[PDB]
Amino acid sequence: YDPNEKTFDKILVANRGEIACRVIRTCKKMGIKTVAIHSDVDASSVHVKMADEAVCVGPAPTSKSYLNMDAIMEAIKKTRAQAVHPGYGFLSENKEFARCLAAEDVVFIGPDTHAIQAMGDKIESKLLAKKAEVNTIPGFDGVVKDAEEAVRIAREIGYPVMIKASAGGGGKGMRIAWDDEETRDGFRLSSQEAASSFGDDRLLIEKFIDNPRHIEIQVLGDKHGNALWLNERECSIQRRNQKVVEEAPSIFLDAETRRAMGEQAVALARAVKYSSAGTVEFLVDSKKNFYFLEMNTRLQVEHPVTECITGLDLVQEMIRVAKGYPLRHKQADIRINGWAVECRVYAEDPYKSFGLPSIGRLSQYQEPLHLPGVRVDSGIQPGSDISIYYDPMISKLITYGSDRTEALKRMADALDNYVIRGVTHNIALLREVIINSRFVKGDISTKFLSDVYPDGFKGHMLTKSEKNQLLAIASSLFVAFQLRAQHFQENSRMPVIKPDIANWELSVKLHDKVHTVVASNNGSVFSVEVDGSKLNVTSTWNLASPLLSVSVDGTQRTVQCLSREAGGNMSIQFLGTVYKVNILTRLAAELNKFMLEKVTEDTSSVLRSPMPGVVVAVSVKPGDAVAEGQEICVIEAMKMQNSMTAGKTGTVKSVHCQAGDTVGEGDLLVELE
Amino acid sequence: DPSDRLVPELDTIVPLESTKAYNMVDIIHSVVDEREFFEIMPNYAKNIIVGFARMNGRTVGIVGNQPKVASGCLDINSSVKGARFVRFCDAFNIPLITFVDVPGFLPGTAQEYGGIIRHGAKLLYAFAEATVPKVTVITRKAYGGAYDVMSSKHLCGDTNYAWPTAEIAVMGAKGAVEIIFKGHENVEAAQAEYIEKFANPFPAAVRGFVDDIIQPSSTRARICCDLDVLASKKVQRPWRKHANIPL
Amino acid sequence: ATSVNERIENKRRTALLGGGQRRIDAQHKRGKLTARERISLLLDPGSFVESDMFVEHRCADFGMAADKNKFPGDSVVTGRGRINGRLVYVFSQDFTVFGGSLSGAHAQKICKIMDQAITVGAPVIGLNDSGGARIQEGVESLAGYADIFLRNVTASGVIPQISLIMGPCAGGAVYSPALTDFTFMVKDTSYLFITGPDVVKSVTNEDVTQEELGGAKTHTTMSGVAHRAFENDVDALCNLRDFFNYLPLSSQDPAPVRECH
Ligand SMILES: CCC(=O)SCCNC(=O)CCNC(=O)[C@H](O)C(C)(C)COP(=O)(O)OP(=O)(O)OC[C@H]1O[C@@H](n2cnc3c(N)ncnc32)[C@H](O)[C@@H]1OP(=O)(O)O
Ligand SMILES: Nc1ncnc2c1ncn2[C@@H]1O[C@H](COP(=O)(O)OP(=O)(O)OP(=O)(O)O)[C@@H](O)[C@H]1O
Ligand SMILES: *C(=O)CCCC[C@@H]1SC[C@@H]2NC(=O)N[C@@H]21
Ligand SMILES: [Mg+2]
């Protein structure tokens, strides 16, 4: 971070979230004044209060705040901005933004307009790759307009078929077809989808490849023609075609393949004249047959993982090459210095479609910065709220180490000490995928999340020893709370006679099983007998801290007590998964048998709102005897459209999901019969 | 739960613009020890919250307004519910903590025919008679006589705080302007003068009606310390067999 | 689009700066401290809780309605703190703002502190340096003095009152220290007289300076008004901290018992 050389004096970031905080921090490292833009809602964000000066750019929605380009130029000309940084998404890869910035004296930190035009659509990128000795996925070249021609082309190219619309992208418009009839099915359904979404109708048919491990290469170039490749990243684990867990050093590849990929990527960058930092993505199969997938002319969200193995700051290099300085590193300097794995903590519910986005404020928020080998990139803070207008992004958690196993151990420790209260996160899913057997071994693929959980995410299937440990921890916590309840101050008028309970007999109900537990206290150590098995739990027993560190039979565990009730209910986060238990005294448990259960009037035939959002399409009508699997309605929520189906055949009695309305979670809208 | 624990989540809990509501139960949970709160009458008179909590291990009674329900207005049911709890807490030496966000009393002919005056007087009596230490925090607003009913400084209150988003006024700004500037025929410059002159905690702070304007994130540490010094509070009142509550 | 937070910020800054930076410098050049650092030296570190920071005077006569005559705090800093772990209520007059002379808001703040102390049962320590009463304030200054005197008499024998004169107290500001249990002065910088030397020369036709008329020596040697005299402000504050440990917090408490070796 040498400030001796001449550098810009004012930079205006044109993005929000954690990337805005990261770029602001990097600018502040070099002693550069930083300007930030925000909507009305984000006036109290961390990035606006960390930047030097903040400017409102319109109302809350992205269309009138972060897509109001004229507002961006107005803010720039108000603030005397020398440069501008778009981060990722939004206006990062807009040709009109680039030409408007070039019209003024402001300089755009990133790729030039030519690269954006070249990489905007798949046809031009594919032909440029073909003429630049780049391997590509086999198939027909050009836009297919006839269904019969499409199925014939599928016949020549091969039995597997994939259809993807030209341009657009971002996890939509991609379909898989198998047979010729299925080929034409995919053809016209993709035509309809493209017409509805973008209207280009430029869908492309190509030879689909199974087990397409998603690897990528980070390329960095300057205006002088020098370009380098920054090792590689592995980003195969996805759901709905978005990465959630990704790792820089790909264990699948070796040294020679990595060198070949780097040389090919730098050759492609030279061919396209890429003078900025970008990513090139490849789909490697089981036989190490590399295939060009796409090249992103913007900073990647997973850039921190590849900037720690190389031990460099990428945003500083991006700013330097935007200024025009030559690269100060060569290909021989790029070296691997360990291992790095990082995950994307979202505001989603993993039990619904591998993450259903949710909303709410943050009552409690704490990050494990004190743990070794932990790096957190978050654009939120205690008190921040998650709206239905932006991506349900919470944080990026990065762990670096000497090798894969130690880095994964640090990562699991980092999740175990991550405190979020107020919204529903996907920490359990990340924990499960990072402690999976095949993930540890290395055998992973694109459809890993789909085929490991065929029926959807269910949570941690804890074993017998882990179940005993959890039961012992819960019983010890219950006894500790009961003992703390008896510590009053001295009265001197009515002295307190403390009860003398040698052993606590408890009936812990977990899932649908009742366990008999005997708990004894000896100072700070609890001896717990669960169904004859003996365990020792030792801890400081701080009942106020959100995180509790305990030792069970010499094994260290971290526990979060999400909730507790006087009736016995207790929700505890164990191994990243929230378990609900019911702890009762033996006398109370035996007296509970004589007591009637409360009738619940929710025996199916109820269609509430799984997530809060705006209804965009309704496919039901009062009196419709729709069958199972029929979509009740379509809900849009913060960059995701979900069409929940029907679990059983029934006749709709009343429809309360009027079109163009916002509904919260659990809003009953259809009651079938 | 440490006494000096900060609560930064409360720095933006109150919306910047007035017509939006928020949950006072969130503030109560954030302030009290271990975020534990035993609510009394949770399903009756939802526009007011009364309950028991602990600060630094000492039991306290929490009374607050609910902007979610009825926009925080006061009515008969809420007045009685608050008054009985305040009377009990005062009778059994339990400190009182109040969170004030009220636009006044709920209007209508149903409230007048039900005796809203008597029950408002019940609540005002309950707060005024209390001898136990009382701490008051004004979150967003306190308009009219309700500001007096919510344990103001002049009811022998012990400590009063105001958040930076608070405002204490006689009545609504529009109503005050239209009732004071009838003969001036100005509704634009006078409105701005009133808005950026009296829609703020500064008139009360200058008048000394609030001891300080505190950042919300420091409210808990600001309260516990007060409860340390008010534990030995003792006052004397004229002798009487019993007073005549306006029941 | 409201700047109320920023207004709070500059009001806090102005109240902390008192009556001005260059006036603070002039007040330092005569070997004296300001009220805020005086309180910071007197009390335990990180224990001062201030009250009525944003209170100023009401006067609208003789041109005090102007924005230049509106000082938040209004020539007095009032609050509570701890000495060696024991609670105490303190007020310090600010000689910068209008010479420290008392007005309605000044007496209101002192009366509020005294009422809180008598309700809780804690001693009151008052650092006094004021030129008298604001003449343009009117009879409100006399009302404030009468309220202070009434609270001093009512609390006499209930809680210990300690007065430390660290500046030129004159006029009606001298009756409050004499109405407390103990009166302490600082040498060569604090004066205590009902009437100034110029009026004495005008009336009785004799020449005396302030030092021999109301200085620390003439009140600790021949007048019997003050009980002790200290070299400077720091020494006086340290000695008052030492002296506070002897006294009980209230008349309901027995004599303090410390650890004896
Ligand atoms: C019960 C009835 C009463 O209270 S009789 C009040 C006393 N009668 C007077 O005329 C005040 C005379 N006393 C003083 O001026 C100073 O306090 C004395 C004791 C002389 C201190 O000496 P010295 O350092 O020279 O004062 P100074 O020239 O620096 O004056 C500083 C500012 O203080 C102010 N000040 C003081 N007393 C009042 C007062 N009662 N009312 C209004 N203002 C007062 C003065 O205005 C003076 O203002 P400035 O900063 O010099 O412009
Ligand atoms: N030809 C293909 N064969 C197999 N899987 C493919 C193929 N093309 C795409 N995929 C799958 O679809 C995913 C989406 O890839 P891609 O990066 O092109 O999508 P995008 O989000 O639209 O683009 P970008 O991130 O470059 O803006 C890939 O990660 C891969 O899992
Ligand atoms: C919107 O407010 C945030 C946009 C987030 C972009 C996401 S994440 C990375 C993917 N790449 C892209 O262009 N959209 C997707
Ligand atoms: Mg891509």
**In chain A, what are the domain boundaries?**
4-136, 137-208, 209-446, 447-595, 596-673
Q: Which residues of A are catalytic?
A: 294
Task: Enumerate the H helices of A107-227 as residue ranges.
Answer: 113-120, 122-131, 147-157, 180-197
**Given the structure tokens 């808005």, which residue do they identify?**
B195
Number of other CB atoms surrounding residue C11 within 10 Å = 19
Task: Give the ligand 2 atom nearest the CA of A279.
Answer: 26
CA angle in degrees (0–180, nearest 5) for A376-A381-A387: 110
- The Cα C44–Cα C34 span in angstroms is 17
**What secondary structure does DSSP assign to A84-103, as a single string?**
EE--SSTTTT-HHHHHHHHH
A346 lines ligand 3 (CB under 6 A): no
From the list A362, A654, A568, the residue with the least C-alpha distance to B30 is: A362
Ligand 2 proximal residues by C-beta, below 6 Å: A 137, 162, 169-171, 174, 206, 208-209, 212, 214, 238, 241, 281, 283, 293-294, 296, 446
- Do B90 and B131 meet the contact criterion of CB atoms below 8 Å apart? yes
CA gap C133, C173 in Å, rounded = 8
Q: Residue A614: beta bridge partners?
A: A636, A662
Angstrom CA distances, A319 to A7, A299, A312, stand at 9, 12, 13
Q: How far is CA A590 from CA A215, A530, A593, in A?
A: 58, 18, 6
Residue among C225, C219, C169 nearest C194 (CA):
C169
Distance (Å, whole) CA A424 – CA A578: 11
- CB-based contact A286:A211 (threshold 8 Å): yes
Cβ of C99 below 6 Å from ligand 1: yes
Bridge partners, A585 (sequence order): A506
Sign of torsion over alpha carbons A476, A477, A481, A482: negative
**Residue A85 main-chain phi, psi, to 5 deg:** -130, 125
Any CB–CB contact under 8 A between A387 and chain B?
A: no
A312 burial level (CB within 10 Å; 0-12, 13-18, 19+) = middle
Cα(B79)–Cα(A646) distance, integer angstroms: 47
CB A615 within 8 A of CB A634: yes
Instruction: Dig out the tokens for C8 from the structure.
Output: 């709070």
Chain A contact present for B26, CB below 8 A = yes
- The count of C-alpha atoms lying within 13 angstroms of the C-alpha of A339, restricted to the half-sphere facing its C-beta, is 15
List residues bridging with A530 in a β-sheet.
A517, A533
User: Of A446, A438, A440, A430, which Cα lies nearest the Cα of A214?
Assistant: A446
* DSSP code, position B209: S
Cβ atoms within 10 Å of A211's Cβ, excluding its own? 16
* A647 Cβ under 8 Å from any chain B Cβ: no
In whole angstroms, give the CA distance from residue B123 to residue B107. Answer: 17
**Contact yes or no for C132/C196 (Cβ under 8 A):** no
Contact between C94 and C38 under an 8 Å Cβ cutoff? The reply is no
Residues of A with CB below 8 A from B11's CB? 44, 383
Instruction: Kindly state the tokens that stand for A51.
Output: 């930047």
CB–CB of A382/A391 below 8 Å?
A: no
Q: Per the structure block, which two tokens stand in for C191?
A: 């004066």
Residue B229 is nearest to which of C4, C5, C87, comparing CB atoms? C87
Distance C127 CA to ligand 1 centre (A): 17
Distance CA B217, CA B225 (A): 15
Q: Annotated binding residue at A59?
A: no
Residue A306 neighbours by CB under 8 Å, 6+ apart: A218, A230, A231, A232, A233, A248, A314, A340
- Whether A184 has a binding-site annotation, put simply, is yes
Token pair in block for residue A8? 């810009």
Task: Quote the CA–CA distance of A215 and A213 in Å, as a whole number.
Answer: 6
Strands, DSSP E only, in A472-597? 504-510, 513-522, 525-530, 533-539, 547-552, 555-564, 569-574, 577-585
Which tokens in the block code for residue B147? 């500001």
| Token pair 């755009």 in the structure block, residue | A108
Torsion of CA A264, A265, A267, A273, to 10 degrees: 160
- Is the CB of residue B164 less than 8 Å away from at least one CB of chain A? no
Q: How far is residue A141's CA from residue C57's CA, in Å, rounded to a whole number?
A: 84
Whose atoms come closest to the Cα of C132: which ligand? 1
Q: How far apart are the first and last CA of chain C?
A: 64
A373 Cβ below 6 A of ligand 3: no
Angstrom distance (rounded) from CA A140 to CA A144: 9
Give the number of beta-carbon pairs within 8 Å between A and B. 27
Candidates A197, A391, A393, A396: which one to mutate for ligand 3, based on the most atoms within 8 Å of Cβ? Answer: A391
Name the residue type at position A369: L
Residues facing A63 on adjacent strands: none
Cβ–Cβ gap A361/B9 under 8 Å: yes
- What is the residue type of A655? V
Give the closest-approach CA distance of C77 to chain B in angstroms. Answer: 13
3-state DSSP assignment of residue A670: strand
The first and second tokens of residue A527, run together, are: 């001896």
CB atoms within 10 A of CB B184: 10
Residue A132 DSSP class: T
Is the CB of residue C36 less than 8 Å from the CB of residue C17? no
| A420/chain B closest Cα distance in angstroms | 12
Strands B212-213 and B159-162: parallel
Q: Dihedrals φ, ψ of C92, to 5°?
A: -130, 125
Alpha-helical runs (H) found in chain C: 4-17, 21-29, 35-42, 104-120, 140-154, 175-178, 197-204, 210-214, 216-220, 233-244
Q: Give the strand pairing for A504-510 and A419-421.
A: unpaired
d(Cα A15, Cα A34) in Å, to the nearest integer? 13
CA A242 to ligand 2 center in whole angstroms: 9
Terminal alpha carbon distance of chain B: 40
Ligand nearest to the backbone CA of C190: 1
Q: Which among A474, A411, A402, A475 is positioned nearest to A439, based on CA atoms? A: A411
Helix (H) or strand (E) holding A228: strand A227-229
Determine contact, residues C216/C186, Cβ cutoff 8 Å.
Answer: yes
Distance A113 CA to ligand 2 centre (A): 23
Give the chain B residue nearest C51 (alpha carbons). Answer: B211
Which string of DSSP letters, residue by residue, matches B103-169? Answer: --BPPSHHHHHHTHHHHHHHHHHHHHH--S-EEEEEEEEEETHHHHHTT-TTTT-SEEEE-TT--EE
Q: CB within 8 A of A511, min separation 6: which ones?
A: none
Cα of C50 vs centre of ligand 1, distance in Å, is: 26
Report the C-alpha gap between A667 and A647 in whole angstroms. 17
Given a contact cutoff of 8 angstroms between Cβ atoms, the answer to whether B6 and B220 are in contact is yes
Please, what is the Cα angle at A306 between A304 and A310, to 5 degrees? Answer: 115
Cβ atoms C234, C41 nearer than 8 A:
yes
Token pair listed for A91: 């206006």
Partners of chain B (3+ Cβ pairs below 8 A): A, C
B174: part of which helix (H) or strand (E)? helix B173-180
CB contact under 8 A, B212 and C108: no
Q: Which two tokens stand for residue A396?
A: 């990026």
Option in C2, C54, C119 nearest B202 (CB): C54
Counts of helices then strands in chain C (DSSP H, E): 10, 9
Question: Which residue among C54, C56, C120 places its CB closest to the CB of B229?
Answer: C120
PDB resolution in Å: 2.8
Q: Is B51 in contact with B38 (CB distance < 8 Å)? A: yes
Chain A: residue whose CA lies nearest to B33: A544
Hey, is the C-beta of B39 within 8 angstroms of any chain A C-beta? no
A95 in Cβ contact with A24 (< 8 Å): no
For residues B100 and B139, the answer to whether their CB atoms sit within 8 Å is: yes
DSSP assignment of A237-284 equals -EETTEESEEESS-SS--HHHHHHHHHHHHHHHHHHT--SEEEEEEEE
- Contact list, C5 vs chain B (CB under 8 Å): 164
Q: A298 CB contacts (<8 Å, ≥6 apart)?
A: A86, A88, A89, A92, A93, A110, A111, A278, A279
Strand partners, A279: A218, A296
Residues 6 or more apart from C60 whose CB is under 8 A from it?
Answer: none
- A361 Cβ under 8 Å from any chain B Cβ: yes
Listed in sequence order, the residues at least 6 apart from B215 whose beta carbon sits closer than 8 Å to its beta carbon are B11, B164
Q: Which residue of A has its CA nearest to B15?
A: A41
Residue A198 assigned ligand-binding role? yes
**B211 inside 8 A of chain A by CB:** no
Q: Is C30 helix (H, G, I), strand (E, B) or coil?
A: coil
Amino acid sitting at position B118: R
Q: What is the number of residues in chain C?
A: 261
Residues with CB under 5 A from ligand 4 (ion): A 281, 294
Instruction: Indicate which of C52, C56, C67, C110 best probes the interface with B, i.e. most B CBs within 10 Å of its own CB.
Output: C52
Asked if A361 and B10 come within 8 Å (Cβ–Cβ), the reply is: no
Chains that touch C (3 or more CB pairs under 8 A): B
User: For residue A235, how far is its CA from the centre of ligand 3 (angstroms)?
Assistant: 15
Residue B10 with chain A: CB contacts under 8 Å: 383
Question: What is the bridge-based pairing of β-strands C124-128 and C86-93?
Answer: parallel
Q: What are phi and psi of A273, to 5 degrees?
A: 60, 50
User: Residue A295 C-alpha to ligand 4 middle, in angstroms?
Assistant: 7
Are B234 and C108 inside 8 Å of each other by CB? Answer: no
3-state percent breakdown (helix, strand, coil) of chain C, nearest 5? 45, 15, 40
A22 annotated ligand-binding residue: no
| CA distance linking residue A208 with residue A161, whole number of Å | 5
Atom of ligand 3 nearest to the CA of A389: 2
- A307 contacts A101 by C-beta, under 8 angstroms: no
Residue C135 backbone phi and psi in degrees, to 5: -65, -45
Start-to-end Cα distance in chain A: 68
Whether C55 and chain B come into contact, CB under 8 Å, resolves to yes
Q: Residue B60 pairs with which residues in a beta bridge?
A: B53
How many cross-chain Cβ pairs, B to C, lie less than 8 Å apart?
A: 48
